[PDB]
Design a protein around this ligand. Sequence first.
Ligand SMILES: *[C@@H]1O[C@H](CO[C@@H]2O[C@H](CO)[C@@H](O)[C@H](O)[C@@H]2O)[C@@H](O[C@@H]2O[C@H](CO)[C@@H](O)[C@H](O)[C@H]2NC(C)=O)[C@H](O)[C@H]1NC(C)=O
Ligand SMILES: [Ca+2]
Ligand SMILES: [Ca+2]
Length: 189
Amino acid sequence: STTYIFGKGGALITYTWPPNDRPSTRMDRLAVGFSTHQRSAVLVRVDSASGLGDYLQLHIDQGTVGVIFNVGTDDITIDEPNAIVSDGKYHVVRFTRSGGNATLQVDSWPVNRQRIPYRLGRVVDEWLLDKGRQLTIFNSQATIKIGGRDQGRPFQGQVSGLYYNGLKVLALAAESDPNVRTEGHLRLV
Ligand SMILES: *[C@@H]1O[C@H](CO[C@@H]2O[C@H](CO)[C@@H](O)[C@H](O)[C@@H]2O)[C@@H](O[C@@H]2O[C@H](CO)[C@@H](O)[C@H](O)[C@H]2NC(C)=O)[C@H](O)[C@H]1NC(C)=O
Ligand SMILES: [Ca+2]
Ligand SMILES: [Ca+2]
């Protein structure tokens, strides 16, 4: 696992697909480990090419993980309101999108009366029961931006082992892949 520390003042890791083979997908799969004391941050954002409305965004609002996405139609929110993640401890998020449906999993190891921190998984599913086929495709994904600096909501804390549709974006940043740029106050562990 590759780990980055996002320090004070923000940082940005950006993966840019080659402009002539940008993926379009029905299903997206995001995994990421992190720790932060922030109650409000953007962690990951995938943007479609300019001129398209499509995006995927992983964030923390009021101390809980949520994902908001748009594949052409409406903004779709899936939140995990029962897991506090802003305690400075390690959490793992797993997000799968399928059309306008999504699964959001948040793993934690809570110490609570003090106890042995066995794992507590919390999964949320979100389905759209709309007769006929809706807009299901995330079109021409252009950038994955990690650290929230371009949303004005900079992440501060650790990020570990990010995985998005096959890409281990942090392993590629650490090895200086030509499609990754790293900026700001960032350090590799
Ligand atoms: C989005 O998900 C819907 C609904 O999923 C179905 O319903 C329940 C919701 O709780 C869920 O438990 C099941 O997993 C189940 O699949 C999908 O809607 C289905 O679409 C297919 C093909 O169009 C139809 O044959 C079904 O009638 C229809 N189900 C219903 C209840 O309308 C939808 O396909 C899916 N979208 C994508 C892109 O995967
Ligand atoms: Ca679309
Ligand atoms: Ca449908």
